[PDB]
């Protein structure tokens, strides 16, 4: 309920804002999946000259 | 190869084999070598004045490359540490005495230097 | 120069009212190309490099600026021949180059701009580039550019509360002034600048 | 001899001012400002010192007064030695002496010695250089042989014989000098911040006070030494305004907002306490003899006024010393921002 | 999993109370006394619950006026202003100013290109960078013995330097259409090589305690993600171009290419993610990989085979002659192809001919003629794309300098890459781009 | 309004409210605002010097309404008062008010903002950035001035008074 | 206008509001202005922020 | 709406949000944009209003004083303060007491 | 006397003090890579009980190492004012001492010392690792010597006065 | 693009994750094995020796 | 020794016998760093000249 009230007025900014030509401040909290991080394997793609 | 305190040799002889060219003076980077030379009484071509600031230069080694008698040397001293900025000024004095101290190491070195090329 | 190489000249088809002045030189490397760009026109080919088809995959990788006012040929002054790009430099205030790289074309390509006024007038392209941010507040501050429709015109790697375009030829390596400590303001000061000379 | 003192005022730190001075006694308060006086119009300064502890920074930051090259620090300096100070006013056209017993030694035998013995040997090496062109010799206001404070007795027997010694030496006798590094309103904040309930008083607070800059005095100097005439002249230096002991912790307590509590001792037993036990900066008999008499400028010498400078208000003065110590009370949001 | 977004951003609308800073954002100078930043960065960061939100770096407490002491210098005089600008890539700032120089003169450095010492230092030079940025990522995230580990290689790397050129730093070895062949021996080589061997070791010792655990993949995985569009954008180039899977080295580059890069068979890799974890194992990698380029350029300048008997059809081996002692031979190529250039720079100096002691004067009076023209000549320096752009007027002095340091570039992002991350985040990012502020400033 | 200056960038008055229960609202002319500033775009072009006068007199009016709290926090009340500091960069504008280049004033105004920024966040320290505020020929008003040059040359030409200071040190 | 309730577009352009509605100056200098401040211009709601203050 | 703009709809894919929501550089303004011939801040026009409500419009009589000044002096010289010392003339600071 | 006390003590004092001398880990220029080379195992400072330290509140040295320019002038001074006492600063690299290779550059203050008092100086450019271990070594037997320099003279019962 | 290859961290050496750098390894070792073979079988190493008449 | 103990030659000085380093006439005896001393570097002109 708490969050609700920041959620209210977002339809409208968005809906009457263009998220990309307009300048429009927010911020945000980037998140990772600590269950995929340690379940990522290692690995690189090895380029070499043609043959 | 090391660079490390800047010092002035002479001939075995005892004769200072700096000579009043400038060479190290136009080649320092750093504009820290001071060169002011007079004749000498019985005629020779030497300096009057010949100043390092240790502080201002970088210890690259443009001076002894850049001397075409090898007057100049950064011999392998680097136990220089100073508690006064002003003794950090080196003077002709200084460069003398250091040199004096360090030629044979100081020879040593520019033995097997000069005997490479051949 | 033994590669396939081509000239940029779709900027200047696309914009049919603009006139070509386009170098190659071994001095550079074998896909590196040097063109004129007027100022008027700067911002809008700029617009149609970021989007245009095989210009798309472009970075603006460097830009910095000249001051040709004070350059001059000090050796070889017969042998300059009316094609060289050194001609440009005489009696212009300034020349600001950009460089940017193709991946594409596998390319190279720096545009030349004369700003002959005296306020150094040009439009900013940090809205269409985002790092030509840093390097163009660079230019600005280090030379004096007046760059217009730039997102900041902070000023990046000069000293705060000093107004001064260090790089320009007529200012003095030494500087004007020297930052001391004071023991009566107990605190760090600058006053006149007094140096020394080898 | 020629008292005449040819030197350029016009340039910094690295220009060439004309004058080589040397200063006893720059490890006191006063001795650092002085230093830079000079140094900071490019004159060459010398500071023979025998203080310990060595790595102090009193010692530390007296090479700043001028730069490289310019100022040199004579450490272990001998004070009972002529050939010592003769090295050190060698090739000093200016002797400058501020060489007088601190406040924390209430022997007689050694406050004497400080302010006499120093004081004339400094005189008498100056004699004997010709090239000493100009001594200034620090005394104290108030110096009187019936006073009861040791040191003003000692400084009004040292300041004659340097007049006897060197006729043309000039002495300053300032008041109470305040400043960031003083031992006035340093000492009232941190007597009040050690008790945080009083400031500890031992009389009727009835004494006359004068405060001037430290700046004001470096100035004082400076026209001093551009000025030939006042060779040979005693100066009694001091602010515009005589103010009373009370009145002064009056305006320190309005300036910096600290409610103002002062708690009475009886002169007599906190004498008798003060001068039977060990004796440290904030805890020494001077200051509880020095709280009756009065330090102020006298009509009997030459004023401020003479030296052509104009001394700042106590009250404007010592408020930017006291802004980090400042009552917080009731304050707005804006100003909460800090 | 149920959604987050509103949970995980927070917009602002016009003149509205919940939808705006309810609270007083935390102001901080990171930098520029401080561990994490290098030590001439100044950042206003703005937390708002220990994660950043707003980004103002002040990068001028390193500037220095390079560029303008370079310009009021002739070209020699200015080259160890290349060491400074970059502390663990200061060879390769000298090829590239050296590179520059040779492109205005019109010439080519063939002494230092058949001796290999221009390839084989610059790939010593980057293991020394990645080492330096390996260890000093592993140092910010946590990790103590990793920088001792990896600062044990480049004492090593350093002792190589001095013993090139005498001194540990800045080495300020090359220089334009010359090469101290002197220097140049063949037990350096041969200590080269066991310091390649040997590094597997460090490499390996790094890897059991950084590829795998579990808190180095949940603290970089995922961190700093950024897509070839941010690149392109960006100018990112180097390890984080690659991270970005362009595949973009300007070493292998056919008309780009400066050295004998592209003469040998070595590999560059890219990953398809761009985060700090792949740019990790990008620069481990390449760690691992400059040590073969090495041995390559090594082998390059070696005599492998030897006489055979024709009656016993065994080697027969010179007692008395230097090659016996060693197998690499610097010189080899050199002499064999340029045998009157060889020849001459070994007989003739400034103590006995007229002409080497006049020009052996005007070079250090006043540095050698360069022709008027523009250049830009640039290198893959471990830190990325860095190049150098040259106008001279004829003269003995560069009318104008400009440098090119992907340095500023990467630090261009940070912002973009670390907007939203929490502070520890931020002290790993600043670490993973790679960035020092002299070549910055 | 997305910007340093924006009536948003307010500092909160309260923890759970913005200066009251009824309204909201918050100071950030006299004082800097909550946000840092991340960019400060360009000043847009002026076409006319009635423009550049305009942009000139807006710039000089909002560092009069900042001086006190620069003041307040650098601890230079002492040296001058915020008139006194007022009158005294209006003087350095006048030096200046000869110009009659829009770009070059627009150039000069985007300068000014941008080390009045610095002023209020600190980034410049009291006495470097006190010469702007010093004044011209008036002693500062936390030291004691010496009139010992006034009182030697009283009623003698400016031209008389620097040749007996001189302009060269006279060891040398 | 699709999406955008009672808003309704006119000749030069679609409104930022219902038709009776008032227009809101600082919308407009968000639209049109965004990011971009000459000055920091007191209007009166900056005038009365600062009294509220 | 933040489905249509492109957000991350799913558990999974909110740790991709910085990529849809940030990453996205801007679109740089329209050329004509910069062609504008006044930038002056938008305010509502006062014609027809009060006398009071006017007072608070733009001053354009101050505009047209100024644009007036800059006609009749095209080029003025360079003003210069006098550096050379002069006695305060508020003199409290060196001549208050309290 | 309070010598018989004071000076036992006075040398257990400088003994402590010199065994632990934690420097500060502030490092501006390629110099700052020099002292982490003399920090690291090679030449391990830890052998003479020298501690990096982030705060100035918890440092004894102040490492000047590396060039210091006017737009960072007034954060070393508020650093060195910052630092506890007792302490002591050592210059490194020639940048620090006298401006190196910038002494003709405008932003470049020309030495450290004008703005610190500047106990001890390093040359080099960059110094070397034992070059840095040299000037601590040095610094830290001056540092011992500090308490009792002889300054106190001796009466005719040996007792200094 | 169409068979990319790729280098997979899967055991504590990343040295045997590669056949290249296995070859690197082994080179290496057999470079060191035929140095200190020969200078075995030479039994002796000139050097220079410093002379103090070179400078007469 | 300095260059012995530094590792640049395997070389050694040797009192009495054939040396490798050369022995000239001006030649002065070794001394320790002398700064913060008395017998310390004084630039002529210097205020403790
Ligand atoms: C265990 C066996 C069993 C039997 C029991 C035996 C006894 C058990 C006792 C248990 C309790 C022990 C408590 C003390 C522990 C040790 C610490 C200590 O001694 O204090 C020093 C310690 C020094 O201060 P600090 O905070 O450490 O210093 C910080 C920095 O130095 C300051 O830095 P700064 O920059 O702010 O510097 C400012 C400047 C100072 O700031 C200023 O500039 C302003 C001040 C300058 C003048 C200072 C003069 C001294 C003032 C004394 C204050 C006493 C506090 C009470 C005041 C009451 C007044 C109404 O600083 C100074 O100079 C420091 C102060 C110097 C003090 C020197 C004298 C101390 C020793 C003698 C004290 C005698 C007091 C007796 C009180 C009455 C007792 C009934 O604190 C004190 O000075 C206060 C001590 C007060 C308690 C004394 C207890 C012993 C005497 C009791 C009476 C006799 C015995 C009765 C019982 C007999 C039973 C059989
Ligand atoms: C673990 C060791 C603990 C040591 C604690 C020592 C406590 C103090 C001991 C004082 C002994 C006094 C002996 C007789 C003195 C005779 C001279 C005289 O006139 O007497 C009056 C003396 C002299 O003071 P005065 O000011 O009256 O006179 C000066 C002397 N004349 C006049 C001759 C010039 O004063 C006293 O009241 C006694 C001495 C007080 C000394 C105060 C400083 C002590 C410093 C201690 C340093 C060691 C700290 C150890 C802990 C360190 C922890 C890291
Ligand atoms: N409030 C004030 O400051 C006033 C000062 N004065 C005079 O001005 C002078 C300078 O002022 P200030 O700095 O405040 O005073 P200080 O007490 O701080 O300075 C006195 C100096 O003399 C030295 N000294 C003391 N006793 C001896 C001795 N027996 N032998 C040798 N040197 C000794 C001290 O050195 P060490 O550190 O080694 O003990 C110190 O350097 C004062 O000494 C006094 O004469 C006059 C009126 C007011
Ligand atoms: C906190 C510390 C801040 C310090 C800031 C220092 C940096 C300042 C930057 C430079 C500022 C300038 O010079 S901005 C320079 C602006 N240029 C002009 O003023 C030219 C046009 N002049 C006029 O319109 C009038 O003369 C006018 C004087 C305006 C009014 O005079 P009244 O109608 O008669
Ligand atoms: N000591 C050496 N230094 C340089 N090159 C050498 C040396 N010894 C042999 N070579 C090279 O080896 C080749 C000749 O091979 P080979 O006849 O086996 O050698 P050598 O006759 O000197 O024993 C030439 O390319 C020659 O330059
Ligand atoms: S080492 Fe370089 S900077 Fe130093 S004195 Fe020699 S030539 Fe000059
Ligand atoms: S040291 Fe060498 S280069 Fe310098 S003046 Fe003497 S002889 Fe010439
Ligand atoms: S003195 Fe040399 S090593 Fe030290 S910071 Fe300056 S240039 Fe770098």
């Given at each position: 309920?708490?969050?609700?009230?920041?959620?209210?007025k977002?339809?409208?900014?968005?809906?009457?804002?263009?998220?990309?030509?307009?300048?429009?401040?927010?911020?945000?909290?980037?998140?990772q999946?600590?269950?995929?991080?340690?379940?990522?394997?290692?690995?690189?793609?090895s380029?070499?000259?043609?043959? | 190869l090391?660079?490390?305190?800047?010092?002035?040799?002479r001939?075995?002889?005892?004769e200072?084999?700096?000579?009043?060219?400038?060479?190290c003076?136009?080649?320092?980077?750093?504009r820290?070598?001071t060169?002011?030379?007079?004749?000498?009484?019985?005629?020779?071509?030497?300096?009057?004045?010949?100043?390092?600031?240790?502080?201002?230069?970088?210890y690259?080694?443009?001076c002894?490359?850049?001397?075409?008698?090898?007057?100049?040397?950064?011999?392998?001293?680097?136990?220089?540490?100073?508690?006064?900025?002003?003794?950090?000024?080196?003077?002709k004095?200084?460069?003398?005495?250091?040199?004096?101290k360090?030629?044979?190491?100081?020879?040593?070195?520019?033995?097997?230097?000069?005997?490479?090329?051949? | 120069?033994?590669?396939?190489y081509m000239?940029?000249?779709?900027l200047?088809?696309?914009?049919?009212?603009?006139?070509?002045?386009?170098?190659?030189?071994?001095?550079?490397?074998?896909?590196?190309?040097?063109?004129?760009?007027?100022?008027?026109?700067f911002?809008?080919?700029?617009?149609?490099?970021?989007?245009?088809?095989?210009f798309?995959?472009?970075?603006?990788?460097?830009?910095?600026?000249?001051?040709?006012?004070?350059?001059?040929?000090?050796?070889?002054?017969?042998?300059?021949?009316?094609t060289?790009i050194?001609?440009?430099?005489?009696?212009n205030?300034?020349?600001?180059?950009?460089?940017?790289?193709?991946?594409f074309?596998?390319?190279?390509?720096t545009?030349?701009?004369?700003?002959?006024?005296?306020?150094?007038?040009?439009?900013?392209?940090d809205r269409?580039?985002?790092?030509?941010?840093?390097?163009?507040?660079?230019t600005?501050?280090?030379?004096?550019?007046?760059?217009?429709?730039?997102?900041?015109?902070?000023?990046?790697?000069?000293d705060?509360?000093?107004?001064?375009?260090?790089?320009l030829?007529?200012?003095?390596?030494?500087g004007?002034?020297?930052?001391?400590?004071?023991?009566?303001?107990?605190?760090?000061?600058?006053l006149?600048?007094?140096?020394?000379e080898? | 001899?020629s008292?005449?003192?040819?030197?350029?005022?016009?340039?910094?730190?690295?220009?060439?001012?004309?004058?080589?001075?040397?200063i006893?006694g720059?490890?006191?308060?006063?001795?650092?400002?002085?230093g830079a006086?000079?140094?900071?119009?490019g004159?060459?300064?010398?500071?023979?010192?025998?203080?310990?502890?060595?790595?102090?920074?009193?010692?530390?930051?007296?090479?700043?007064c001028?730069?490289?090259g310019q100022?040199?620090?004579?450490?272990?300096?001998?004070?009972?030695?002529?050939?010592?100070?003769?090295?050190?006013?060698k090739?000093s056209?200016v002797?400058?002496?501020?060489?007088?017993?601190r406040?924390?030694?209430?022997?007689?035998?050694?406050?004497?010695?400080?302010?006499?013995?120093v004081?004339?040997?400094?005189?008498?090496?100056?004699?004997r250089?010709?090239?000493?062109?100009?001594?200034?010799?620090?005394?104290?206001?108030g110096?009187?042989?019936?006073?009861?404070?040791?040191?003003?007795?000692?400084?009004?027997?040292?300041?004659?014989?340097?007049?006897?010694a060197?006729?043309?030496?000039t002495?300053?006798?300032?008041?109470?000098?305040?400043?960031?590094?003083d031992?006035?309103?340093?000492?009232?904040?941190?007597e009040?911040?050690?008790?945080?309930?009083?400031?500890?008083?031992?009389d009727?607070?009835?004494?006359?006070?004068?405060?001037?800059?430290?700046?004001?005095?470096?100035?004082?100097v400076?026209?001093?030494?551009?000025?030939?005439?006042s060779?040979?002249?005693?100066?009694?230096?001091?602010?515009?305004?005589?103010?009373?002991?009370?009145?002064?912790?009056?305006?320190?307590?309005?300036?910096?907002?600290?409610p103002?509590?002062?708690?009475?001792?009886?002169?007599?037993?906190?004498?008798?306490?003060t001068?039977?036990?060990?004796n440290?900066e904030?805890?020494?008999?001077?200051?509880?003899?020095?709280?009756?008499?009065?330090?102020?400028?006298?009509?009997?010498?030459?004023?401020?006024?003479?030296?052509?400078?104009?001394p700042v208000?106590?009250?404007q003065?010592?408020?930017?010393?006291?802004?980090?110590?400042?009552?917080?009370?009731?304050?707005?949001?804006?100003?909460?921002?800090? | 999993?149920?959604?987050?977004?509103?949970?995980?951003?927070?917009?602002?609308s016009?003149?509205?109370?919940?939808?705006?800073?309810?609270?007083?954002?935390?102001?901080?100078?990171?930098?520029?006394?401080?561990?994490?930043?290098?030590?001439?960065?100044?950042?206003?960061?703005?937390?708002?619950?220990?994660?950043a939100?707003?980004?103002?770096?002040?990068?001028?407490?390193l500037?220095?006026?390079?560029?303008?002491?370079?310009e009021?210098?002739?070209?020699?005089?200015?080259?160890p202003?290349?060491?400074?600008?970059?502390?663990?890539?200061?060879?390769?700032?000298?090829?590239?100013?050296?590179?520059?120089?040779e492109?205005?003169?019109?010439?080519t450095?063939y002494?230092?290109?058949?001796?290999?010492?221009?390839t084989?230092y610059?790939?010593?030079?980057?293991?020394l960078?990645?080492?330096?940025?390996?260890?000093?990522?592993?140092?910010?995230?946590?990790?103590?013995?990793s920088?001792?580990?990896?600062?044990?290689?480049?004492e090593?790397?350093?002792?190589?330097?001095?013993?090139?050129?005498?001194?540990?730093?800045?080495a300020?070895?090359?220089r334009?259409?010359?090469?101290?062949?002197?220097?140049?021996?063949?037990?350096?080589?041969?200590?080269?090589?066991?310091?390649?061997?040997?590094?597997?070791?460090?490499?390996?010792?790094?890897?059991?305690?950084l590829?795998?655990?579990?808190?180095?993949?949940?603290?970089?995985?995922?961190?700093?993600?950024?897509?070839?569009?941010?690149?392109?954008?960006?100018?990112?180039?180097?390890?984080?171009?690659?991270?970005?899977?362009?595949?973009?080295?300007?070493?292998?580059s056919?008309?780009?290419?400066?050295?004998?890069?592209?003469?040998?068979n070595?590999?560059?890799?890219?990953?398809?993610?761009?985060?700090?974890?792949?740019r990790?194992?990008?620069?481990?990698?390449?760690?691992?990989?400059?040590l073969?380029?090495?041995?390559?350029?090594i082998?390059?300048?070696?005599?492998?085979?030897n006489?055979?008997?024709?009656?016993?059809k065994?080697?027969?081996?010179?007692?008395?002659?230097?090659?016996?002692?060693?197998?690499?031979?610097?010189?080899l190529?050199?002499?064999?192809?340029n045998?009157?250039?060889?020849?001459?720079?070994?007989?003739?100096?400034d103590?006995?001919?007229?002409?080497?002691?006049?020009?052996h004067?005007?070079?250090?009076?006043?540095?050698?003629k360069?022709?008027?023209?523009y250049?830009?000549?640039?290198?893959?320096?471990?830190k990325?794309?860095?190049?150098?752009?040259?106008?001279?007027?004829?003269?003995?002095?560069?009318?104008?300098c400009?440098?090119?340091?992907?340095?500023?570039?990467?630090?261009?992002?940070?912002?973009?890459?670390?907007?939203?991350?929490?502070?520890?985040?931020?002290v790993?990012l600043?670490?993973?781009?790679?960035?020092?502020?002299?070549?910055?400033? | 309004?997305?910007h340093?200056?924006?009536?948003?960038?307010?500092?909160?008055?309260?923890?759970?409210?913005?200066?009251?229960?009824?309204?909201?609202?918050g100071?950030?002319?006299?004082?800097?605002?909550?946000?840092?500033?991340?960019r400060?775009?360009?000043?847009?072009?002026?076409?006319?010097?009635v423009?550049?006068?305009?942009?000139?007199?807006?710039?000089?009016?909002?560092?009069?309404?900042?001086?006190?709290?620069?003041?307040?926090?650098?601890?230079?009340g002492?040296?001058f008062?915020?008139?006194?500091?007022?009158?005294?960069?209006?003087?350095?504008?006048?030096?200046?008010?000869?110009?009659?280049?829009?770009?070059?004033?627009?150039?000069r105004?985007?300068?000014?903002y941008?080390?009045?920024?610095?002023?209020?966040?600190?980034?410049?320290?009291?006495?470097?950035?006190m010469?702007?505020?010093?004044?011209?020929?008036?002693?500062?008003?936390?030291?004691?001035?010496?009139?010992?040059?006034?009182?030697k040359?009283?009623?003698?030409?400016?031209?008389?008074?620097?040749?007996?200071?001189?302009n060269?040190?006279?060891?040398? | 206008?699709?999406?955008?309730?009672?808003?309704?577009?006119?000749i030069?352009?679609?409104?930022?509001?219902?038709?009776?509605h008032?227009?809101?100056?600082?919308?407009?200098?968000?639209?049109?202005?965004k990011?971009?401040?000459?000055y920091q211009?007191?209007?009166?709601?900056?005038?009365?922020?600062?009294?509220?203050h | 709406?933040?489905?249509?703009?492109?957000?991350?709809?799913?558990?999974?894919?909110?740790?991709?949000?910085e990529?849809?929501?940030?990453?996205?550089?801007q679109?740089?303004?329209?050329?004509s944009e910069?062609?504008?011939?006044?930038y002056?801040?938008?305010?509502?026009?006062?014609?027809?209003?009060?006398?009071?409500?006017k007072?608070?419009?733009?001053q354009?009589?101050?505009?047209?004083?100024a644009?007036?000044?800059?006609?009749?002096?095209?080029?003025?010289?360079?003003?210069?303060?006098?550096?050379?010392?002069?006695?305060?003339?508020?003199?409290?600071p060196?001549?208050?007491?309290? | 006397?309070?010598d018989?006390?004071?000076?036992?003590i006075?040398?257990?004092?400088?003994?402590?003090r010199?065994?632990?001398?934690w420097?500060?880990?502030?490092?501006?220029?390629?110099?700052?890579?020099?002292?982490?080379?003399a920090?690291?195992?090679?030449?391990?400072f830890?052998?003479?009980?020298?501690?990096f330290?982030?705060?100035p509140?918890?440092?004894?040295?102040?490492?000047?190492?590396?060039?210091?320019?006017?737009?960072?002038?007034?954060?070393?001074?508020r650093?060195?004012?910052?630092?506890?006492?007792?302490?002591?600063?050592?210059?490194?690299?020639?940048?620090?001492?006298?401006?190196?290779?910038?002494?003709?550059?405008?932003?470049?203050?020309?030495?450290?010392?004008?703005?610190?008092?500047?106990?001890?100086?390093?040359?080099?450019?960059?110094?070397?690792?034992?070059?840095?271990?040299?000037?601590?070594?040095?610094?830290?037997?001056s540092?011992?010597?500090?308490?009792?320099?002889?300054?106190?003279?001796?009466?005719?019962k040996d007792?200094?006065? | 693009?169409?068979?990319?290859?790729?280098?997979?961290?899967?055991?504590?050496?990343?040295?045997?994750?590669?056949?290249?750098?296995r070859?690197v390894?082994?080179?290496?070792?057999?470079?060191?094995?035929?140095?200190?073979?020969?200078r075995?079988?030479?039994?002796?190493?000139?050097?220079?020796?410093?002379?103090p008449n070179?400078?007469? | 020794?300095?260059?012995?103990?530094?590792?640049?030659?395997?070389?050694?000085?040797?009192?009495?016998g054939?040396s490798a380093?050369?022995?000239?006439?001006?030649?002065?005896?070794?001394?320790?760093?002398?700064s913060?001393?008395?017998?310390?570097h004084?630039?002529?002109?210097?205020?403790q000249?």
């Amino acid at each position: 309920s708490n969050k609700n009230y920041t959620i209210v007025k977002q339809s409208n900014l968005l809906t009457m804002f263009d998220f990309f030509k307009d300048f429009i401040n927010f911020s945000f909290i980037r998140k990772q999946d600590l269950n995929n991080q340690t379940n990522f394997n290692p690995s690189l793609r090895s380029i070499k000259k043609k043959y | 190869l090391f660079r490390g305190e800047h010092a002035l040799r002479r001939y075995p002889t005892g004769e200072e084999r700096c000579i009043a060219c400038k060479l190290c003076q136009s080649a320092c980077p750093a504009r820290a070598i001071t060169i002011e030379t007079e004749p000498r009484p019985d005629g020779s071509r030497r300096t009057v004045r010949y100043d390092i600031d240790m502080t201002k230069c970088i210890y690259c080694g443009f001076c002894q490359e850049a001397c075409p008698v090898d007057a100049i040397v950064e011999g392998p001293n680097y136990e220089q540490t100073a508690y006064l900025h002003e003794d950090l000024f080196y003077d002709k004095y200084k460069l003398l005495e250091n040199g004096d101290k360090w030629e044979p190491q100081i020879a040593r070195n520019i033995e097997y230097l000069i005997n490479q090329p051949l | 120069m033994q590669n396939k190489y081509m000239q940029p000249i779709q900027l200047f088809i696309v914009f049919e009212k603009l006139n070509s002045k386009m170098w190659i030189s071994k001095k550079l490397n074998s896909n590196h190309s040097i063109a004129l760009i007027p100022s008027n026109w700067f911002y809008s080919i700029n617009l149609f490099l970021k989007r245009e088809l095989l210009f798309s995959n472009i970075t603006l990788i460097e830009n910095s600026a000249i001051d040709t006012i004070s350059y001059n040929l000090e050796t070889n002054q017969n042998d300059l021949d009316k094609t060289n790009i050194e001609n440009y430099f005489f009696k212009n205030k300034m020349l600001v180059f950009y460089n940017y790289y193709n991946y594409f074309l596998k390319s190279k390509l720096t545009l030349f701009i004369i700003l002959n006024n005296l306020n150094k007038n040009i439009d900013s392209i940090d809205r269409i580039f985002a790092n030509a941010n840093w390097l163009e507040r660079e230019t600005s501050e280090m030379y004096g550019i007046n760059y217009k429709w730039k997102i900041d015109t902070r000023k990046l790697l000069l000293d705060y509360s000093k107004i001064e375009n260090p790089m320009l030829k007529e200012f003095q390596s030494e500087g004007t002034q020297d930052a001391f400590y004071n023991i009566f303001e107990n605190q760090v000061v600058v006053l006149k600048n007094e140096t020394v000379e080898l | 001899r020629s008292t005449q003192l040819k030197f350029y005022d016009g340039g910094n730190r690295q220009s060439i001012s004309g004058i080589r001075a040397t200063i006893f006694g720059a490890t006191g308060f006063m001795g650092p400002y002085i230093g830079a006086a000079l140094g900071y119009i490019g004159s060459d300064v010398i500071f023979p010192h025998n203080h310990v502890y060595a790595y102090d920074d009193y010692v530390k930051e007296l090479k700043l007064c001028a730069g490289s090259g310019q100022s040199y620090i004579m450490r272990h300096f001998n004070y009972d030695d002529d050939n010592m100070y003769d090295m050190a006013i060698k090739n000093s056209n200016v002797v400058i002496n501020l060489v007088g017993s601190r406040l924390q030694n209430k022997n007689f035998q050694k406050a004497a010695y400080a302010n006499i013995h120093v004081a004339k040997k400094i005189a008498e090496a100056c004699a004997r250089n010709p090239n000493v062109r100009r001594l200034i010799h620090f005394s104290a206001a108030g110096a009187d042989t019936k006073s009861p404070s040791p040191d003003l007795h000692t400084k009004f027997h040292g300041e004659e014989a340097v007049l006897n010694a060197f006729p043309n030496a000039t002495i300053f006798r300032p008041c109470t000098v305040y400043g960031m590094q003083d031992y006035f309103i340093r000492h009232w904040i941190k007597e009040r911040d050690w008790w945080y309930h009083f400031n500890i008083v031992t009389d009727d607070c009835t004494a006359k006070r004068q405060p001037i800059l430290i700046n004001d005095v470096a100035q004082c100097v400076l026209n001093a030494l551009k000025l030939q005439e006042s060779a040979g002249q005693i100066y009694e230096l001091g602010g515009p305004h005589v103010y009373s002991r009370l009145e002064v912790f009056e305006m320190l307590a309005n300036l910096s907002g600290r409610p103002p509590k002062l708690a009475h001792i009886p002169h007599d037993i906190a004498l008798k306490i003060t001068q039977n036990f060990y004796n440290w900066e904030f805890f020494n008999m001077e200051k509880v003899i020095k709280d009756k008499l009065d330090l102020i400028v006298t009509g009997k010498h030459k004023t401020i006024s003479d030296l052509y400078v104009q001394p700042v208000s106590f009250p404007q003065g010592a408020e930017q010393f006291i802004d980090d110590v400042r009552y917080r009370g009731v304050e707005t949001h804006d100003n909460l921002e800090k | 999993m149920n959604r987050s977004i509103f949970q995980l951003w927070k917009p602002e609308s016009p003149r509205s109370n919940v939808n705006s800073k309810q609270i007083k954002t935390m102001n901080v100078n990171f930098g520029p006394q401080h561990p994490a930043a290098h030590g001439v960065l100044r950042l206003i960061l703005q937390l708002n619950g220990e994660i950043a939100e707003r980004f103002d770096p002040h990068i001028g407490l390193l500037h220095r006026g390079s560029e303008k002491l370079i310009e009021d210098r002739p070209y020699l005089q200015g080259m160890p202003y290349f060491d400074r600008f970059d502390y663990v890539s200061m060879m390769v700032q000298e090829h590239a100013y050296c590179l520059g120089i040779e492109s205005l003169l019109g010439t080519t450095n063939y002494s230092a290109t058949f001796t290999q010492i221009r390839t084989m230092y610059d790939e010593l030079t980057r293991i020394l960078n990645h080492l330096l940025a390996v260890a000093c990522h592993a140092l910010d995230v946590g990790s103590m013995s990793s920088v001792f580990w990896a600062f044990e290689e480049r004492e090593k790397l350093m002792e190589f330097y001095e013993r090139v050129c005498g001194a540990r730093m800045h080495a300020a070895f090359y220089r334009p259409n010359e090469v101290n062949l002197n220097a140049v021996s063949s037990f350096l080589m041969e200590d080269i090589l066991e310091f390649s061997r040997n590094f597997f070791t460090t490499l390996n010792e790094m890897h059991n305690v950084l590829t795998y655990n579990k808190i180095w993949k949940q603290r970089l995985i995922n961190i700093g993600t950024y897509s070839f569009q941010t690149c392109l954008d960006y100018g990112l180039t180097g390890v984080m171009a690659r991270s970005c899977g362009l595949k973009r080295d300007l070493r292998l580059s056919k008309t780009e290419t400066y050295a004998n890069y592209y003469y040998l068979n070595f590999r560059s890799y890219t990953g398809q993610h761009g985060d700090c974890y792949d740019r990790f194992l990008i620069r481990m990698n390449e760690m691992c990989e400059s040590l073969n380029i090495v041995n390559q350029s090594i082998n390059k300048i070696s005599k492998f085979n030897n006489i055979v008997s024709i009656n016993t059809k065994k080697n027969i081996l010179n007692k008395e002659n230097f090659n016996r002692q060693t197998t690499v031979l610097p010189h080899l190529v050199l002499s064999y192809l340029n045998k009157n250039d060889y020849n001459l720079k070994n007989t003739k100096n400034d103590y006995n001919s007229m002409e080497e002691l006049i020009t052996h004067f005007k070079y250090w009076s006043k540095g050698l003629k360069v022709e008027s023209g523009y250049t830009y000549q640039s290198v893959e320096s471990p830190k990325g794309e860095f190049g150098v752009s040259m106008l001279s007027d004829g003269s003995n002095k560069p009318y104008k300098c400009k440098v090119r340091s992907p340095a500023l570039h990467h630090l261009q992002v940070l912002p973009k890459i670390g907007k939203g991350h929490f502070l520890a985040d931020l002290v790993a990012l600043v670490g993973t781009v790679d960035i020092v502020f002299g070549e910055i400033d | 309004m997305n910007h340093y200056w924006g009536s948003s960038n307010t500092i909160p008055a309260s923890s759970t409210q913005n200066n009251n229960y009824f309204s909201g609202g918050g100071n950030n002319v006299t004082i800097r605002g909550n946000e840092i500033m991340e960019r400060l775009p360009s000043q847009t072009p002026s076409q006319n010097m009635v423009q550049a006068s305009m942009k000139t007199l807006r710039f000089y009016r909002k560092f009069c309404r900042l001086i006190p709290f620069i003041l307040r926090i650098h601890n230079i009340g002492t040296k001058f008062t915020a008139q006194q500091a007022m009158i005294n960069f209006g003087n350095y504008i006048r030096e200046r008010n000869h110009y009659r280049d829009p770009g070059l004033i627009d150039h000069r105004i985007q300068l000014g903002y941008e080390l009045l920024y610095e002023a209020e966040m600190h980034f410049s320290q009291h006495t470097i950035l006190m010469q702007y505020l010093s004044p011209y020929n008036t002693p500062l008003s936390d030291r004691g001035y010496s009139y010992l040059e006034k009182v030697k040359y009283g009623n003698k030409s400016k031209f008389l008074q620097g040749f007996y200071k001189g302009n060269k040190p006279t060891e040398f | 206008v699709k999406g955008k309730g009672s808003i309704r577009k006119g000749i030069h352009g679609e409104g930022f509001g219902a038709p009776s509605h008032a227009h809101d100056a600082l919308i407009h200098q968000i639209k049109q202005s965004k990011d971009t401040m000459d000055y920091q211009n007191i209007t009166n709601e900056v005038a009365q922020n600062f009294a509220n203050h | 709406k933040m489905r249509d703009l492109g957000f991350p709809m799913e558990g999974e894919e909110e740790e991709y949000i910085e990529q849809r929501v940030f990453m996205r550089e801007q679109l740089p303004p329209l050329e004509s944009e910069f062609w504008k011939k006044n930038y002056d801040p938008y305010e509502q026009d006062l014609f027809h209003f009060p006398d009071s409500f006017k007072a608070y419009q733009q001053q354009y009589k101050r505009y047209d004083e100024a644009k007036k000044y800059f006609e009749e002096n095209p080029n003025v010289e360079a003003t210069i303060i006098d550096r050379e010392f002069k006695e305060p003339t508020n003199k409290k600071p060196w001549t208050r007491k309290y | 006397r309070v010598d018989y006390i004071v000076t036992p003590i006075n040398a257990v004092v400088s003994w402590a003090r010199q065994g632990s001398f934690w420097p500060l880990t502030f490092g501006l220029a390629c110099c700052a890579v020099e002292m982490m080379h003399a920090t690291v195992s090679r030449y391990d400072f830890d052998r003479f009980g020298v501690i990096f330290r982030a705060t100035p509140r918890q440092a004894d040295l102040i490492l000047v190492a590396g060039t210091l320019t006017n737009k960072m002038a007034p954060g070393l001074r508020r650093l060195y004012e910052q630092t506890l006492d007792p302490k002591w600063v050592l210059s490194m690299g020639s940048c620090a001492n006298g401006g190196g290779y910038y002494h003709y550059s405008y932003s470049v203050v020309r030495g450290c010392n004008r703005i610190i008092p500047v106990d001890i100086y390093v040359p080099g450019c960059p110094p070397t690792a034992e070059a840095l271990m040299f000037g601590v070594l040095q610094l830290q037997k001056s540092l011992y010597r500090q308490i009792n320099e002889g300054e106190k003279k001796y009466n005719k019962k040996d007792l200094t006065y | 693009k169409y068979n990319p290859e790729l280098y997979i961290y899967k055991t504590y050496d990343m040295a045997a994750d590669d056949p290249v750098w296995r070859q690197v390894k082994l080179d290496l070792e057999w470079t060191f094995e035929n140095i200190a073979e020969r200078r075995e079988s030479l039994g002796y190493m000139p050097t220079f020796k410093g002379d103090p008449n070179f400078w007469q | 020794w300095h260059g012995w103990l530094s590792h640049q030659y395997d070389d050694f000085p040797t009192r009495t016998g054939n040396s490798a380093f050369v022995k000239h006439h001006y030649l002065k005896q070794h001394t320790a760093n002398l700064s913060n001393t008395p017998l310390n570097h004084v630039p002529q002109g210097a205020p403790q000249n």
